[PDB]
Structures are given as structure tokens and as C-alpha cells.
Structure 1
């Protein structure tokens, strides 16, 4: 595999109106990837999803956190941005 889900293709779900099919065939059926974001400066943490240890060597956080679904696709880009010294803060809900 796999197949191929063109730009063309996606523009057609949108016509019908399938939020969920769309979301399923792009952020699930390909890159099902989850990461954990700091609430102040929205960035990858020192997450462990085992010993509930998150911690943040910067904003000094250990209690305030939120989780985000992103494609490893997305992941790379945000990371690749870090190398260009720019910080896409993912300011989630009130967790801002």
C-alpha cells in the first residue's frame, strides 16, 4: 500500500458535507498520531503516557496540560519550523 487521496478527491467530500469521513480518511486512516502540548507555550512536552509524568523544562509546568491529535505529517512541519526558530504555539481551549 497504500492508495492515494488527491486534493481533487478531498474537494468532493466537502461538496457533500462529510466532516467525519473527511477527518477519518486523513487524520486517522493514515497518520493516527497523538502528542501532548503545554498550555502556555504550545509545544511538545516530555510526555510518557505511562507514569503520568509530563513536566516542562521551560514554562515550568507539571499540572497544566492538554492533548492534541495531529498527523505525524503535521508533527514534522512544526518540528521543521523549530529549526527555523519559529514557534507555532498550539494555544488550545481556555488552557491558553
Structure 2
């Protein structure tokens, strides 16, 4: 299993000012996912 990147670590990276570090740790390295949203109603669409 992976290691927890918690609230305090997120705060530390915020005070550092490293926006891309947070984006990588919390999106690209944990649970990256993609959805299609409807521009009219703003809800996830049926995408093939």
C-alpha cells in the first residue's frame, strides 16, 4: 500500500507554494480519473 499524504503535509506544501507538487501528489499519483460533463446541466455525461 501507499503512504498517506495527509492534511499537515498538504499544509506544508501550501506554505511552500508548490502548487504542482500538490497536484501531483493528490491527483497524478493517487486517484487520477477523467469524466465528461454536460456543458448545459453540468452533470457527468454518458461517454463512449
Instruction: Output the TM-score relative to the length of structure 2.
Output: 0.89
The whole-number CA distance in structure 2 between the counterparts of 1:28 and 1:35 is: 15
State the Cα RMSD in Å: 3.2
Count matched residues.
Answer: 47
- 2:15 is paired with a residue whose SS is helix
Flag structure 2 segments of 5+ consecutive residues without an equivalent.
none
The whole-number CA distance in structure 2 between the counterparts of 1:44 and 1:12 is: 33
Summarize deviations over 1:37-87 as a string: whole Å, max 9, x none. Answer: 0001011111xxxxxxxxxxxxxxxxxxxxxxxxxxxxxxxxxxxxxxxxx
Structure with higher Rg: it is 1
4+ aligned runs moved over 2 Å, structure 1 = none
Flag structure 1 segments of 5+ consecutive residues without an equivalent.
47-95
More strand by share: 1
- 1:25 is paired with a residue whose SS is helix
Relative contact order (C-alpha < 8 Å, sep 6+): which is higher?
A: 1
The whole-number CA distance in structure 1 between the counterparts of 2:8 and 2:16 is: 14
